[PDB]
Amino acid sequence: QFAKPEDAVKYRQSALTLMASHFGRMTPVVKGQAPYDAAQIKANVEVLKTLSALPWAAFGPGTEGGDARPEIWSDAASFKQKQQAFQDNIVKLSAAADAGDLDKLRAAFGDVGASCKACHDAYRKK
Amino acid sequence: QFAKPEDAVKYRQSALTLMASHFGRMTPVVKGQAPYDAAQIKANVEVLKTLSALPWAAFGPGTEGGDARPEIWSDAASFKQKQQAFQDNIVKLSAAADAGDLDKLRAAFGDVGASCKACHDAYRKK
Numbered sequence: 001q002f003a004k005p006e007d008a009v010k011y012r013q014s015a016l017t018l019m020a021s022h023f024g025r026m027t028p029v030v031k032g033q034a035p036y037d038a039a040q041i042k043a044n045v046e047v048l049k050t051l052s053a054l055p056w057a058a059f060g061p062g063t064e065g066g067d068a069r070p071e072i073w074s075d076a077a078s079f080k081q082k083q084q085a086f087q088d089n090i091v092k093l094s095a096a097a098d099a100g101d102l103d104k105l106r107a108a109f110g111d112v113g114a115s116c117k118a119c120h121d122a123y124r125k126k
Numbered sequence: 127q128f129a130k131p132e133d134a135v136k137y138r139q140s141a142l143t144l145m146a147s148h149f150g151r152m153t154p155v156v157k158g159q160a161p162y163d164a165a166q167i168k169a170n171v172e173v174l175k176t177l178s179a180l181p182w183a184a185f186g187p188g189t190e191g192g193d194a195r196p197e198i199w200s201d202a203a204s205f206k207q208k209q210q211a212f213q214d215n216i217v218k219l220s221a222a223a224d225a226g227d228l229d230k231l232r233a234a235f236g237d238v239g240a241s242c243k244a245c246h247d248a249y250r251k252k
């Protein structure tokens with residue numbers, strides 16, 4: 001859906017900005033510094049679930065640029081496994097949110113954050 | 127969820143970039159220049175539906191900036207009506223996509239696009 005590679009870069013950077021906001025805004029809740037409203041979090045994690053599937057289609061062939069390392073393309077199977085592990089951890093976070101349990105939410109939240117960082121460590125320029 | 131007003135601006139600009147891509151990528155389909163896959167469009171419009179609810183929470187009090195006109199805040203009821211008309215037209219587009227009918231899709235698509243432009247004409251700086 002991108003006329004030029006710059007358009008895919010702009011897309012993925014916007015998707016990740018959104019995804020970072022919907023993930024990160026829950027930090028005060030999982031730390032206990034903001035109240036835990038199970039319905040509020042369930043609804044936010046549903047938004048996060050939709051957003052977290054979006055970046056990966058915007059790393060198609062020929063869309064080198066931004067802070068993406070070229071290894072995303074030359075090691076595509078390994079990149080796909082990092083994105084699928086991440087997505088699997090988002091499924092786990094959805095489960096916790098749907099269960100309404102702050103203990104499970106905080107554990108699932110930490111797993112997701114670990115998966116974000118692991119991908120960045122391998123595939124994001126510094 | 128925004129530490130500073132700049133963060134709300136960055137959010138809404140990223141949300142609209144996404145929303146513009148999920149709307150605009152259907153232009154070749156509704157013009158007949160790309161094939162119509164009812165399931166493909168249904169799934170894309172579901173993504174668009176989620177994204178099209180996101181910008182409005184990022185125009186909260188004190189988040190003046192970007193290309194937002196100050197009238198968004200001083201005429202809040204009129205801005206809310208433009209965003210709700212837009213959202214209602216997205217419901218209509220979802221209905222058409224869910225029905226699998228290219229004729230209805232193209233009409234609903236044009237209604238949504240009209241609603242985007244009407245808001246920009248009143249509330250977006252040029």
Ligand code: HEC
Nearest residue numbers: 013016020023065066067068082083086115116119123124
């Ligand atoms: C690989 C499978 C990744 C996972 C999982 C996550 N991120 Fe990521 N991120 C990745 C890349 C390759 C890049 C660079 C994209 C580019 O072309 O520039 C990024 C970048 C970011 C950014 C910066 C976005 C920008 O506005 O320029 C942020 C804020 C970010 N990523 C956040 C983030 C979060 C919160 C994640 C888990 C919930 C996450 N990423 C996962 C690769 C991957």
Ligand code: HEC
Nearest residue numbers: 139142146149191192193194208209212241242245249250
């Ligand atoms: C008011 C109810 C709006 C509706 C409906 C739509 N848009 Fe909009 N848009 C609006 C404002 C006030 C602004 C400026 C935001 C800012 O703070 O800068 C915008 C901006 C855009 C942009 C530019 C985003 C950027 O990256 O800076 C685009 C591409 C855009 N809008 C697209 C768009 C589409 C496709 C819409 C209908 C599907 C749509 N907007 C509706 C206000 C409103």
Ligand SMILES: O=C1O[C@H]([C@@H](O)CO)C(O)=C1O
Nearest residue numbers: 020023024113114116117120
């Ligand atoms: O909110 C975020 O969380 C991840 C990471 O900091 C987790 O360690 C990331 O890259 C963000 O912007």
Ligand SMILES: O=C1O[C@H]([C@@H](O)CO)C(O)=C1O
Nearest residue numbers: 146149150239240242243246
């Ligand atoms: O794709 C878009 O459609 C609307 C508008 O052009 C409809 O007239 C807009 O502002 C876009 O970026």
